[PDB]
Design a binder for this molecule. Structure first.
Ligand SMILES: [Ca+2]
Length: 130
């Protein structure tokens, strides 16, 4: 599904993401916007290591979720990648929460560092009553 901005905002808030490990909700929204356009079905294949990024957050199959076809795969979220391609984002959220539990935090995603870090992100949540 392609979420609308405020709808995504409220669902993430509901799911406990506002301020998780000090990351505000606007930061998570900015990340989803650049990573998938808010589309739960986004995918990206990385030929270099043969991994694939999945869902709204573009979670990678070599370290996070298991897709049965990525060598070296470590499955830190203990979750099949195919669960990140559906319309319910609660597992995506649980897995993204685990990712930021590592030392890099949200800097794990290069898109966030390039398009979000240090910038004004209030546009992502303006008008959502979040
Ligand atoms: Ca899901």
């Amino acid at each position: 599904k392609v979420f609308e901005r405020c709808e995504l905002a409220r669902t993430l808030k509901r799911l406990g993401m506002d301020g998780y490990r000090g990351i505000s909700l606007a930061n998570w929204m900015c990340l989803a916007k650049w990573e998938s356009g808010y589309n739960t079905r986004a995918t990206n294949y990385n030929a270099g290591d043969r991994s694939t990024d999945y869902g709204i957050f573009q979670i990678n199959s070599r370290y996070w979720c298991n897709d049965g076809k990525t060598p070296g795969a470590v499955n830190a979220c203990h979750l099949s990648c195919s669960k990140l391609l559906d319309d319910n984002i609660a597992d995506d959220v649980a897995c993204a929460k685990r990712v930021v539990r590592d030392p890099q935090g949200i800097r794990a995603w290069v898109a966030w560092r390039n398009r979000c870090q240090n910038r004004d992100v209030r546009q992502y949540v303006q008008g959502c009553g979040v």
